[PDB]
């Protein structure tokens, strides 16, 4: 009971038993053909970006107030998906993501997972604006906060507002799944693309934001590790980009 | 100065016990070949 | 293809080497002698250690050649050289001189050849009262440990075949040796030590493998 | 160094307490000359062939 | 009688009168499926290799004895054809090499255009060895010498000897095109994939050189220009890699 | 007809020629040895890079002579000499001295012959992982330049085959290699220059060809 899973030259391991949520019904697809027939031709990859990137692992303590991704750009230094980010002036893709854990039977929390399209956050000060740096870090993610922040252009990042002014309880609208270290470790959703354009500039803007938010700390009792790791892994599908010919 | 391949393995999370179980632990490797696997020009071995 | 057990055994090898001389005053250095088995060549010992039971035919062929002993007669004109190769079965007689009887029996196959000519050779089938030779014995002969008496093969004999006060001669005879249409059962892992005698297993303890840097370590790419 | 005597060799360690960024292990894939691989069951084999080619299962 | 040519986001001008060479009667492909069936996959980018790359031009002079590029890594900073050299460990692939001229009626002279398959080279001194910058220096071309050089590590180019010890007058056995400013002065040849194996490393390896070998030299009279400019413009075929996933 | 590949290739030609002793004070002098090439040959060498990629079968013979030392000792009785002519694939042991275990091993391939015979002779296939030899490489080893390890094709090594304390006596090997089943890709010009070394491609520049008088000349008629 124990599937292998191979894309292209990565190899990854998972239970046959999971469960996927597909986000809105929607699967990953290619813009047909004609949209804009004439001048307006695409070309696909289809070489290394359809494989497993695999981030580096979090830790997952006492108190962690939760972590967040912005997507794309936590792939533009990840080998040929991230070199097409330079060459191609126009680009579009879907996405499978995996989310894992590595606890035992002697922890327990519970974790939701969710994937947010256009999370516009706020800043610290009510009459300033965000930095590009306090957005992002690329594949390192930034963290939530226990209590409300300062300092200039920095994202007003309590963990209970979720950095967008709502009730972080409501978050479960997105598509999303929960991990409870009684009953599953793992969690798989699958993002198609979603704009309001067809196309569009993959540097200026972030689609969808990936966030992972502990709501039951993690415990554990005498002698047990006193961390959890979290390991994310990330598929490219059905990448497309403007014709160069 | 190989021009092979390699293998790694890292931490995603740690590893998480109750109170009672053992703290270190032990991971195995076995290898094996695969059904095409093809050899020529039978010569000496370099160990005895 | 060439994985297959024939193309992997059947193979040939130099397995003994020896001198022998027309006149003497030792009279153990008038013929030469040799017991068969495959267990003091160290490279065939190996490839047949891989199996537990084993099922082949031999031939073997005979490169000799000869001398005049440095002694001191010179001026000599002579016819060439004839030899005698004998092969004894298991449960045959044993010549202790050259001299004896047993080089005459009747149920001892026999070669005579002289030299100039092309290499002798002969073909043995598989000889035993059991079904397969075995390479490994956990047992005892009825006692030594490790020896079943179904293994005997044989024996090879060499002398010449002059008359009455021969001259001064020194030969020395290669037997290359070869195993055909072989049948090898239950397969075994390969030796790790090194061999330490003729008739046992012994060895002295060894390390798995040896040593790199660090359980990290891979070495930079070109 | 020190473990090539005992059965300590087969081991990987998995160590204890919050590690979650670190390398647990690594090795280049070369049977027949790496001396990770060169006494098993496979490297043994290769090593009586000059030639050899095919795809291996970890 | 003029054709319009595009590839990619690429386009480029030629006359519908053109005379084409297909190296060895061999057009480009890919190397079909099943030379290494199991655990040897293939990929193809044909994203935006194929397209026009092109060149600096170089200037043609009365005393220009030649010059010469090596392939690949001519291209080894071109765009996504050098990318993807960086990111996959073998590849494969053929070319179309467009050579033109430009010059008036009041011109005249004649080249030599050759493809050489391994054009190794000699050293400057018998007993001596040929250096890594003295063979290529990427997408700027080497020059033969009109006498016989000197100098540790250089490559021995006087140009009668080609530097690989023949006479240049029979360089006509390989792939060749003559450019007579009397008559014409384009020409295109198309490369197959020429190896004694199916794929290869592109770094450590040089599949072909091109060469350009003025036959009779550029006269002009009184107030002409003093130069003629030829340009060449290189389009990759059928390019192949190893699969990474 | 003449001029089609097999014709114009498949030639015998030496290209190897060795001596070496039974006793000496060196003991590299006791065997031979070579390194199966063909750039050591000169007129092998030129038509063979008239084309870029060539594939073939090797055949090999072997003409061996000896002769006692005019050291000192005469009156002396031989028997015919022993000779061991051995082939080693890419990626096998080489031997350093004559007393070697390599000499023994299962996998390379051997020879025995004796004086007076016929002369011996082994059959080599195509051996290379890759598809064809090359004669021209425009590449690095690894670092060479000009040099890659698919044109690896083997060596051979010759001794004597005696036992112990052997009488003193010269041989001389001459080997005669012949190609077989050939075919060719790309043809190329003809190496107008010199060679200068076995490795290289280096020379020195050379004229395009001879002078005459003047650019009317032609010479009177008969």
Known sequence: ?245 | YTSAGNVTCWYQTGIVVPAGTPTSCSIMCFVSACNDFSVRLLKDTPFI | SESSIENFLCRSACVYMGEYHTTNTDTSKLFASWTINARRMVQMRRKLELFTYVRFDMEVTFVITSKQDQGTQLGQDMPPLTHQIMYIPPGGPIPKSVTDYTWQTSTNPSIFWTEGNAPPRMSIPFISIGNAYSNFYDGWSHGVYGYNTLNHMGQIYVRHVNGSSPLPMTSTVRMYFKPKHVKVWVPRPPRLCQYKNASTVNFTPTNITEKRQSINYIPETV | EGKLDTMEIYRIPVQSGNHQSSQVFGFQVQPGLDNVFKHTLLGEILNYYAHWSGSIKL
Chains 1, 5 share one sequence.
């Open chain 1, 1 to 245: 009971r124990v599937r292998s899973i191979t894309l292209g030259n990565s190899t990854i391991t998972t239970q046959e038993s999971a469960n996927v949520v597909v986000a809105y019904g929607r699967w990953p697809e290619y813009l047909k053909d004609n949209e804009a027939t004439a001048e307006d031709q695409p070309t696909q990859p289809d070489v290394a970006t359809c494989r497993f990137y695999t981030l580096e692992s979090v830790t997952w303590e006492r108190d962690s107030p939760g972590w967040w991704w912005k997507f794309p750009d936590a792939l533009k230094d990840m080998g040929l998906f991230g070199q097409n980010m330079y060459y191609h002036y126009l680009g579009r893709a879907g996405y499978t993501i995996h989310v894992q854990c590595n606890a035992s039977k002697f922890h327990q929390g519970c974790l939701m997972v969710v994937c947010v399209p256009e999370a516009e956050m706020g800043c610290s000060q009510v009459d300033g604006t965000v930095n590009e740096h306090s957005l992002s870090e690329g594949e390192t993610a930034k963290k939530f906060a226990s209590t409300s922040t300062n300092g200039t252009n920095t994202v007003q990042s309590i963990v209970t507002n979720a950095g967008m002014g709502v009730g972080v309880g409501n978050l479960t609208i997105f598509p999303h799944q929960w991990i409870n270290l009684r009953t599953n470790n793992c969690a798989t959703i699958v993002m198609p693309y979603i704009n309001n354009v067809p196309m569009d500039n993959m540097f200026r803007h972030h689609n969808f934001t990936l966030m992972i938010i502990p709501f039951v700390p993690l415990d554990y009792s005498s002698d047990s590790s006193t961390y959890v790791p979290i390991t994310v892994t990330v598929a490219p599908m059905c990448a497309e980009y403007n014709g160069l010919r």
